[PDB]
């Protein structure tokens with residue numbers, strides 16, 4: 001299958017798709033665009049948003065929708081339909097929280113104040129829920145890695161850019177990040193991927 | 199299986215689960231809670247959010263995660279791998295918009311303002327994207343009803359509460375709503391369900 005992924009030059013909402021392609025050893029074109037080429041591309045898109053994935057010429061949209069499509073019938077999906085539910089739920093929980101950030105805010109002082117308050121109150125609350133949910137287990141769901149573990153490592157990587165000490169009291173969540181980063185297809189991808197802030 | 203769904207006395211985010219139970223002819227306890235009891239239940243839940251679905255003593259969370267679990271291997275799921283991706287994608291597009299609403303906002307004047315702007319400035323574009331996407335087809339995805347059709351009807355119902363003229367220029371989207379509402383199991387639920395504003 002000929003896969004082509006389109007997004008900005010950043011990890012952002014495309015990174016989960018990139019980890020999945022990497023882990024499943026599926027080749028694809030990692031097409032990254034700059035602001036200048038957005039209006040042209042955007043207009044051809046039914047919903048006007050990226051990422052999009054073209055599969056043998058057919059366009060797919062919605063990053064989590066695409067992530068799930070790529071993990072279908074693989075062990076990254078969750079071993080049972082019940083585990084798949086828990087995987088989807090954790091992914092949505094993380095996405096709901098990531099969506100609270102005013103990423104696009106133009107007023108820098110407002111952006112700073114909002115980031116600080118989300119990182120001071122909400123983030124440590126979520127971290128406790130995540131930590132107790134994982135408990136002393138190896139992975140977030142079941143007994144093998146799922147894309148929910150991937151998403152966690154991805155979201156936390158971005159949160160750590162803004163509050164480096166966020167996981168200072170959560171060694172089990174740090175250990176989870178290290179387990180994910182250590183998967184060889186993931187360690188490789190992380191080494192060769194373009195370096196960007198987000 | 200024993201199913202117990204807990205949410206507020208509202209269609210809201212539990213409604214998609216209710217339509218799915220109805221269509222699949224599954225009995226469940228439709229548990230509805232008052233606001234004053236929420237803080238107490240919230241504290242015992244791994245992630246402090248509703249709806250939750252209890253199955254044989256296992257808690258599930260996240261409405262879409264649950265909806266997806268319930269429709270897996272049923273005729274409400276897409277017919278192909280790729281069609282299931284489109285079902286997921288349409289649902290997420292609708293969810294991304296519904297999430298923008300400050301449902302819980304304390305300040306009335308601020309809340310009204312937010313709602314007005316989203317409905318007046320944003321909603322029209324989603325409708326336009328949806329209308330073009332549907333085109334002249336019968337259902338949003340493929341040749342038969344999916345839970346993406348249920349979600350569209352559910353989201354549109356709530357939006358029409360606040361902006362009744364929202365679909366005046368979109369007869370094909372009105373037709374799809376009517377078509378979902380005509381499904382016997384759906385029509386029966388709509389007729390018998392508690393009548394709430396939201």
Ligand SMILES: COc1ccc(/C=C/C(=O)Nc2ccccc2C(=O)O)cc1OC
Nearest residue numbers: 208209210211296297301302352353356396
């Ligand atoms: C103030 O308490 C309230 C009051 C109303 C609501 C939500 C009502 C509703 O219809 N929501 C939706 C309906 C359809 C699809 C998606 C949503 C969605 O919210 O994502 C929630 C509250 O708790 C936050």
Ligand SMILES: N[C@@H](CCC(=O)N[C@@H](CS)C(=O)NCC(=O)O)C(=O)O
Nearest residue numbers: 012013048049050051062063064294
């Ligand atoms: N939930 C959607 C969000 C899509 C989205 O808002 N993408 C952004 C980039 S992170 C975008 O294209 N927004 C800019 C625009 O619409 O012009 C997804 O994960 O794909």
Ligand SMILES: N[C@@H](CCC(=O)N[C@@H](CS)C(=O)NCC(=O)O)C(=O)O
Nearest residue numbers: 096210211246247248249260261262
């Ligand atoms: N994406 C989640 C959102 C969960 C959510 O925000 N639900 C609301 C009710 S609609 C809630 O539990 N809020 C009450 C609170 O925050 O205390 C889902 O679909 O279930």
